[PDB]
Amino acid sequence: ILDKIFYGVLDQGNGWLYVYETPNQDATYDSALELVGQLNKVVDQLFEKAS
Amino acid sequence: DKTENDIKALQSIGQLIGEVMKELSEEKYIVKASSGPRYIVGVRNSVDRSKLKKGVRVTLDITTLTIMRILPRETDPLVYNMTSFEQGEITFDGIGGLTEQIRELREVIELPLKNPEIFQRVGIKPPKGVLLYGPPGTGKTLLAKAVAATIGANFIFSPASGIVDKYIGESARIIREMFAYAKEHEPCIIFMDEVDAIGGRRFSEGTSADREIQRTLMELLTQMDGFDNLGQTKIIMATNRPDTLDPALLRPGRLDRKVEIP
Amino acid sequence: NDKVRFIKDELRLLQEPGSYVGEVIKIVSDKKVLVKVQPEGKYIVDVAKDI
Amino acid sequence: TLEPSTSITLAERQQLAYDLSISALLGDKIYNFGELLHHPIMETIVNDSNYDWLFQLLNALTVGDFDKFDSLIKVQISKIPILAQHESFLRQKICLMTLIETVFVKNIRMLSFEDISKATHLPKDNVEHLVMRAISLGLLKGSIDQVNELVTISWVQPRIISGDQITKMKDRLVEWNDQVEKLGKKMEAR
Amino acid sequence: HEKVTIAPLVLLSALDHYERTQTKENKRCVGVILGDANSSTIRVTNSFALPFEEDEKNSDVWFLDHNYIENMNEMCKKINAKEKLIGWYHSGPKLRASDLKINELFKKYTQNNPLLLIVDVKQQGVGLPTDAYVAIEQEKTFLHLPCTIEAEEAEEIGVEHLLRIRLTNQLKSLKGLQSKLKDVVEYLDKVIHTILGKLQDVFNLNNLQKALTVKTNDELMVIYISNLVRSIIAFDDLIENKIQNKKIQEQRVKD
Amino acid sequence: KRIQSVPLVIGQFLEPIDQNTGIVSSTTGMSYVVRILSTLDRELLKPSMSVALHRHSNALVDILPPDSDSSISVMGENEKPDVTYADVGGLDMQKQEIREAVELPLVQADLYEQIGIDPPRGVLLYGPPGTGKTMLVKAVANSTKAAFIRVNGSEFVHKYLGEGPRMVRDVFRLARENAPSIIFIDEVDSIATKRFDAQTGSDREVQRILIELLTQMDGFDQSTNVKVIMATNRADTLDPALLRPGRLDRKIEFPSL
Amino acid sequence: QLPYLVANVVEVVGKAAVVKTSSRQTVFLPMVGLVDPDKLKPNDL
Amino acid sequence: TKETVYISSIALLKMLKHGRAGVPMEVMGLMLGEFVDDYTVNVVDVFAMPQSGTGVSVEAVDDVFQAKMMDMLKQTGRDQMVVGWYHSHPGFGCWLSSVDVNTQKSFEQLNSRAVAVVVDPIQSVKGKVVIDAFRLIDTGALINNLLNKANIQALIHGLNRHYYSLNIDYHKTAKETKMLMNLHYEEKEESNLAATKSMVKIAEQYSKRIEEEKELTEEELKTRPKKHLSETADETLENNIVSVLTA
Amino acid sequence: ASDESLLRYGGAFTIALAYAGTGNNSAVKRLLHVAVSDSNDDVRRAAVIALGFVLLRDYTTVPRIVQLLSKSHNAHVRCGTAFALGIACAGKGLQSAIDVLDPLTKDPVDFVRQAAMIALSMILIQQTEKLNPQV
């Protein structure tokens, strides 16, 4: 679980093995990550020009 | 009705073939038309895209120069630069009294071709290439045909000089065609008539035309060295003298079996 | 307005058979020049008045 | 391909009408009598050999009485042995059609398991087995959940006769049209 | 099977032909088409006007020749081999009683079944001009066939030299439903499934797009963020323009 | 857009002359001075690159990934070649020799440069092939997980003016792009055993191919992430430009003993 | 009538046939009996 | 004066259809229509001559063919008289073949208002048709109509005939024009289908504009290009307007 | 409403002539509107020619209305503005008319040179060296 080989978690108190990975929310996460990076770049470039 | 069909056929036009050099994209290809130059082409009506691959022959429009249909690729059977004789025209048992040579030739050729399984179990490869050396005029030639007859192998007779075209890559193309067709039409004997012209040593260390000889010779060594392995395609080299064979060939692993005519 | 006009000029240019490269062999003092073109054979051509 | 070109013979039309009547009781797949009201069983093909049975069948299909099955034709010829497998298949056919028109004017693939039992008039295990066969036969699909008690299978089957097909179509038309007109109006305005 | 490709020359000929022979409303113009049709794709590659007349006594009494057909296909062949006749032509007035009845005569000198192209080649209608039909009896039973255009490489380039959204589709949709209702009322009256049934429940839930909206929304943020970077970019370019103006002013003051 | 579309001829850009104007040699033999696009003139414009040409337009239609072909048969690319340490044990000296010469700059260019020794850029291998030597070459390529580009070096030998120079140019470019990579020259002795004493005439066509190989070889590989490995049937002498430092710097022997 | 195009062949869905012209160009024609089998033999114009 | 040549939609197209298929190694043929001259000349229609093995000369006008074709056209309303002749040829700016002029000259003893028009399909595959129309000069017309013209005056007293270029124009009716642009039903119904399948593919189309932007920003850095970026910004705006419209 | 080119060209002259003398806003709006929104090469040139007749009395205003149009795309338009000024500013010697006509005189497009030359001359008739240095 702790390096995410297993698609689930231990729900202790029930003492049963249950899924947490309802597949990957974050599957377009990296594309977003670049997108942020571009925007920051831009904001910095504009500021130079401005002053 | 038939003569009327000849005018109808005359308005039912043909179109030229070229071969795909490489596919850039599904919208951009490099194709070499057979009229000579290279062109960037796209596609047109009436294609399959699942018979597309690199190195297949395609059909291109006369006036649009785009892929109208996709063809198989074809060896082309020839009698000019590779004359092919399925079986041989003379028997192996009937030429007995040439016995010694017959037996050596059976044991290198017949047994792996019929039964790969035995060579495979031991874990030493099937034999590579065989040389017949000593007189061509004693009935060497008869023996080569004769071995082909019993296996039912495809006999591929090669004129070594004919492998010497003076154009870009025609000479690469022939070696390639000869091998590809051997694999399809395997078992096969590839018989190289007097090897000095595709497997010299150099005239005097100098060059006039003895670089065409080197261009040829590297291609044979490459197929051998390669990932492709000789065992259901057998190559047999023939020359009167071993004193104008290249040292490469004389080294084991490009010829390993050397039969002498006794 | 400039952008349309720019594009039109560009289009006139994009209609061409190209220029051949050649080597000036020698100039004749009557306003011919002898050129070996690499595209073709050898030609006598009329010296330009732009050079 | 017999009737519209004539060439007919009283012997031939006697076999065909009676033969159709026995075969129509003896097996089906579509529905057990609606198709025989757009399906000549005695519309001047011939009226002999007691074609009362066709009308008897529709009354029998609705009630679902055993007494009615014997009194549909005559005892032995009602049974076949054909009807012994047949009654369950025939049974589901009456239930399926009756609900299909009635439950929601739109036609949606939502049925109560309970109201399929109540309407078909069979016990709780039995209907479980009958439905189990019925999904196998197709004209259905989309995946009924046998827990949630949701008969949630997709709408796709043919709809019977030109009668309440037409009533149902009018209601559905006013609605399909109204929906389109709203979208159009809003777009138009801005 | 069928999949019909139709020359723009076919449409444009039929147009020009109707006016040039002075054909009024209440006279038909009938034609022939030929090409290649023994294939899955029916290729209409040429066509020709046919002499046609209709009588005063009843206008479903009419004259079509066959001899203008006998020797004209054997002149079609002689420019382009493979442009024999398989069927036929109509400009309207459309869907008459004897618009069935050219079929049995055109069965005499076709090689499959007469293909019936009715086309509104006055171009007066709204939407499609092509009322294409496979000519089958059983009466004017008339299963329609959907497909116009596909033409030659040379023709399409020439076409463009001659010539040089959600709502429009929705309005069409509204008109069909509205027509469909009107028909259903009429049809009950005269008389005294599945397609309609998928056309109501399915759309009840921009309507369809609702259910999809959940998935759309996530990507919809993303593509919005992309437009925002572009707005910043326009501001950046803007600042340079302000400086350019600012420079000019500054130089004019030094001078 | 539509005016500049397929069908197309292939050319190569030789150099930009001035603004909006470039010289191309097309592959046919006809050389054109053409325009480049204004949006291809800046920030996508290389001094020599492979191009898409129109056959009426005489304008820069498209810029191509460099791999434009020749009327000689195409060379072989083998990602992960299948000979991978077959023969070993008792090749102790030749295995060690290869290992420090060929593998290390491909995995790390940067350590050689930091020491400040020159990385091997080209290596010459001499002694027989197909008897223990080839096996190692292939294995190194596979273990470094670089593309094996098997390049037929007796196949320049085309009999025409220059198809052959165009092809070498495409291959060195494409190697630096698809780094890490091995260009493996089968029999370099074909296109570079010439004039040492006014013997081995008839080698005028390979002289252009030779100049082209040297300009590409020495001018790249400055940090080394792309290796050239030279191969000779036993040994052959070469023309002096290869052999000097900056190119074939390691000269590796297969033991007699 | 000459001037006409000859072809020197050295070659011995439906069936495809390759012709080699002496302009050293390979061309597609069908061998479905629109083009007869007896109009091909190697070594021949 | 001299002619201005209005070619009809069906005439232009027929000229291209026949010429392409008849290739260089030529087919020949006739133009049909009429005009009332000095500013109005109309080409209504055209038909093909059937390929003859002596290239495209006066010998290739099959008079039986033309006669039978003219009569059959007549019976379907479409027959008119020859206003000239057209063909297909190697293409020349001084006359497309030698044969077309030598054919034209025989015609010219009969007519005195017959043109030679040819379109050349070699240069009509750059996506812009190359089409020419030329006629020879006539005396007593092109000097009476268009110091004065010394040049053209010594030219006409001299050669008597020489090539001159005729203008390319078109004429078409409104009926054609309306009912092309509902073909170019397929377009409206095709438009719905296209919107639906676009939203399907958007997963990839998303990712590439993400890349385009990363290049874009990096570019602006290096400079400090601007033009691209603006064009690059505009395009991205257009695509989102489309993405939103879909859904 | 006639869809003939000749007739749409002819329509533009009809406003110029009808509304001549003292200018009328409605008349200028319609002509400028055809000039901008019609793409037909005769039609745009005639609707610019037409502004000069409306505007004969108020001739000061014609260099501003036609300022833009003189540097605007398509030579027929540029031709039309030469005429506009030529007719409207004739005899007055408006300094602003001449400044607009200068670029157009050495314009590549031959009939643009032509019409500007005709135009310059009508404004500057019987105006001399010294009075105007430029002539």
Swiss-Prot record, chain C:
Task: Tell where it localizes.
Answer: Cytoplasm; Nucleus
Q: How is it modified after translation?
A: N-acetylated by NAT1.
Sequence intervals crossing the membrane = none
Assembly and binders: May form a homodimer or a heterodimer with a related family member. Interacts with OLA1, TMA17, and UBR1.
**Extra information:** Present with 4700 molecules/cell in log phase SD medium.
Which purpose does this protein serve, as stated in its record?
A: The 26S proteasome is involved in the ATP-dependent degradation of ubiquitinated proteins. The regulatory (or ATPase) complex confers ATP dependency and substrate specificity to the 26S complex.
Q: What does the similarity note say?
A: Belongs to the AAA ATPase family.
- What protein am I looking at? 26S proteasome regulatory subunit 8 homolog
Q: Which organism is it from?
A: Saccharomyces cerevisiae (strain ATCC 204508 / S288c)
This protein's gene is called RPT6
Segment of the intact protein contained = 52 to 102 of 405
UniProtKB/Swiss-Prot annotation, chain D:
Q: Which residues form the signal peptide?
A: none
Ranges of residues in domain PCI: 1-158
Q: What else is known?
A: Present with 12400 molecules/cell in log phase SD medium.
Entry function: Acts as a regulatory subunit of the 26S proteasome which is involved in the ATP-dependent degradation of ubiquitinated proteins.
The entry's family comment says: Belongs to the proteasome subunit S11 family.
Q: What is this protein called?
A: 26S proteasome regulatory subunit RPN9
Organism, per UniProt? Saccharomyces cerevisiae (strain ATCC 204508 / S288c)
Q: Which gene encodes it?
A: RPN9
Curated annotation (Swiss-Prot), chain E:
Output the InterPro entries linked to this UniProt entry.
EIF3F/CSN6-like_C, JAMM/MPN+_dom, MPN, MPN_RPN7_8
* Entry comment on modification after translation: N-acetylated by NAT1.
Q: Name one Pfam family in it.
A: JAB
Q: Does the keyword Membrane apply?
A: no
Keywords attached to this Swiss-Prot or TrEMBL record, sorted alphabetically, are: Acetylation, Phosphoprotein, Proteasome
Cellular-component GO terms for this entry: proteasome complex; proteasome regulatory particle, lid subcomplex; proteasome storage granule
Residues in coiled coil: none
Which PROSITE patterns does the protein's record reference?
Answer: MPN (PS50249)
Any one of the GO BP annotations: ubiquitin-dependent protein catabolic process
Question: GO: which molecular function terms?
Answer: metallopeptidase activity
Per the database record, which ranges form the MPN domain?
Answer: 4-138
What is the purpose of this protein?
A: Acts as a regulatory subunit of the 26S proteasome which is involved in the ATP-dependent degradation of ubiquitinated proteins.
Entry's family note: Belongs to the peptidase M67A family.
Q: What else is known?
A: Present with 19800 molecules/cell in log phase SD medium.
What's the protein called, per UniProt?
Answer: 26S proteasome regulatory subunit RPN8
Origin species, per record, is: Saccharomyces cerevisiae (strain ATCC 204508 / S288c)
- Give the source lineage, highest ranks first: Eukaryota, Fungi, Dikarya, Ascomycota, Saccharomycotina
From Swiss-Prot, chain G:
Q: How is it modified after translation?
A: N-acetylated by NAT1.
Span of the full-length protein shown?
A: 74 to 145 of 434
- Where in the cell? Cytoplasm; Nucleus
Q: Which organism is it from?
A: Saccharomyces cerevisiae (strain ATCC 204508 / S288c) (Baker's yeast)
The coiled-coil segments of this chain are none
* Superkingdom as given in the UniProt entry: Eukaryota
Q: What is this protein called?
A: 26S proteasome regulatory subunit 6A
Family, similarity comment: Belongs to the AAA ATPase family.
The protein's job, in short, is: The 26S proteasome is involved in the ATP-dependent degradation of ubiquitinated proteins. The regulatory (or ATPase) complex confers ATP dependency and substrate specificity to the 26S complex.
